[PDB]
């Protein structure tokens, strides 16, 4: 219950699962430049509003 299951569950297995899910989310881009450049426009607007308005 403790060594083989829950101590595994909390520290190492949770870390592995979270990193794998984040890796899948980050790397699954279809390679279409339309989506990338739309995200670029969103980023440029955000940087102009949230950092450039605060100085």
């Amino acid at each position: 219950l403790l060594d083989l299951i829950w101590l595994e569950t909390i520290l190492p297995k949770t870390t592995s699962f979270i990193q794998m899910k984040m890796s899948i989310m980050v790397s699954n881009q279809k390679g279409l430049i339309k989506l990338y450049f739309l995200s670029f426009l969103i980023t440029i607007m955000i940087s102009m509003t949230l950092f450039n308005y605060h100085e």
Partner: protein, 44 residues
Amino acid sequence: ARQWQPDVEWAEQFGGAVMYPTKETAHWKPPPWNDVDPPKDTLV
């Protein structure tokens, strides 16, 4: 008695287009052995 070494079943885990295949990414194919895709029959 000999040390375990990877076999074909172990090696095929690294032969896909990605690690951790999902339902969306399972249809992704690995690139051609040379970096050359077959020509498309897009007759003009």
